[PDB]
Structure formats: C-alpha cells, structure tokens
C-alpha cells in the first residue's frame, strides 16, 4: 500500500519509472539488469527459469540439460 520500499536486486538502486520494474523470485530487477546467467540475454519480458537463485532463458535451460541427464 502506501508504505513500502523499492530496490533493484541486481544493481541495488530503487526501481521506479512511472510504472516500470521486473518482479521475479520475490524480488525487483531493472528491465536491463534482469537477464540470463549464462548467455545474459534480456529477460525483461520473456519465458525464463529459476535455478540456484538464478535466471535461465528457456533456450539455455534446455542447453544446460545436454550436458548430461544424470543428476537431473
């Protein structure tokens, strides 16, 4: 509501732009900051995954598997 504090988990600065901000993993990141951990692709608005408190784009998430079926 009225009270509350903002913040960008990525850089740290507050996230505000007249209706701007990417919420993921119970956190807030800037459209730019919010990106993959492998290819570091712009995930501002797309399908991604969550592994080890990280962000992996569908593409990567699928690529990582190739590595090996064992251990998930």
Among 22, 33, 35, 55, binds Zn ion (CB under 5 A): 33
Residue among 21, 31, 38, 58 that touches Zn ion (CB under 5 A): 38
> Binding Zn ion by CB under 5 A: which of 39, 51, 62, 65?
39
Q: Number of residues interacting with Zn ion: please give it, by CB under 5 A.
A: 10
Angle at 17 between CA 14 and CA 29, to 5 degrees: 45
By CB under 5 A, tell whether 43 contacts Zn ion: no
Burial (CB < 10 A; 0-12, 13-18, 19+), residue 6, is exposed
35 near Zn ion, rule: CB under 5 A: no
């Amino acid at each position: 509501g009225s009270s509350g504090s903002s913040g960008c988990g990525g850089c740290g600065e507050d996230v505000v732009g007249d209706g701007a901000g990417v919420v993921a993993l119970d956190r807030v990141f800037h459209v730019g900051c919010f990106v993959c951990s492998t290819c570091r692709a712009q995930l501002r608005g797309q399908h991604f995954y969550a592994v080890e408190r990280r962000a992996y784009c569908e593409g990567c998430y699928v690529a990582t598997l190739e590595s090996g079926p064992s251990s998930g």
